[PDB]
Amino acid sequence: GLTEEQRMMIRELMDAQMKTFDTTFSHFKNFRLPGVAAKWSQVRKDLCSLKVSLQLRGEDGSVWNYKPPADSGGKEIFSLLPHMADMSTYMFKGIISFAKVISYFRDLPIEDQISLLKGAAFELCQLRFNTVFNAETGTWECGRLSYCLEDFQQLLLEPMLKFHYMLKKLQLHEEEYVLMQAISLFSPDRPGVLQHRVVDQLQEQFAITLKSYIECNRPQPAHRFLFLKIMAMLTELRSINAQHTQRLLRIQDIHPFATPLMQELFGITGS
């Protein structure tokens, strides 16, 4: 029960997701793996908040399985950074392809495109990982890869992990996940955006379509206020993004790891 423009909107967003999101992670390869003075206390706190074991199912049926070390006050806490930087770079490329395919994004001036991508790449990445997150086992299932949280109520103290469990509980459709990505991408208040009036009108239209979609396709009392919960999710995710951008820059300051694409998105110039 949407306007013709509203369903053309969902159709195009659902199309750009289909073309740019490798849900089986088939083309993620050549990645790195762990081998076979008051900043550090913060960096140690930054790192220990999301430790994860890693499983690789080979095409032949073999299984590699990695258990990370415990914190012993040394550089061994940096063991997973190259791999997770390689995974982030792969996700970021899918995000950039996603935005480039959308006509509303394409139509913005280029300098506004980079500004919007710098501001929302993390958030769109987190949103895509939620669709492959298994809340019953605490595992991100990325095709032949899987990432299982180490052994509960004290794990939800981490805001990002708390975000993933709450978003998964909302039981969202594919159409609702992609409208969330559009709203986060077309945020008029990212640093450096110039066409903020255009970008705000675009954002307001993606939110209105989402509100109408829920009310057309979700009449159950369980989904009362669902639109407002999602919009609050997005504000929460957005705060998680800011506070994590500093986590990453702190680690980068004392132990470099960011790929060239990660530097581009986060403002590191090379000197």
Ligand SMILES: N#Cc1nn(-c2c(Cl)cc(C(F)(F)F)cc2Cl)c(N)c1[S@@](=O)C(F)(F)F
């Ligand atoms: N952005 C994005 C982003 N995705 N991820 C992420 C990765 Cl790489 C892997 C998993 C896995 F399932 F594999 F465990 C889960 C997640 Cl949520 C992380 N750590 C980030 S950020 O910290 C960064 F580094 F800035 F990209």
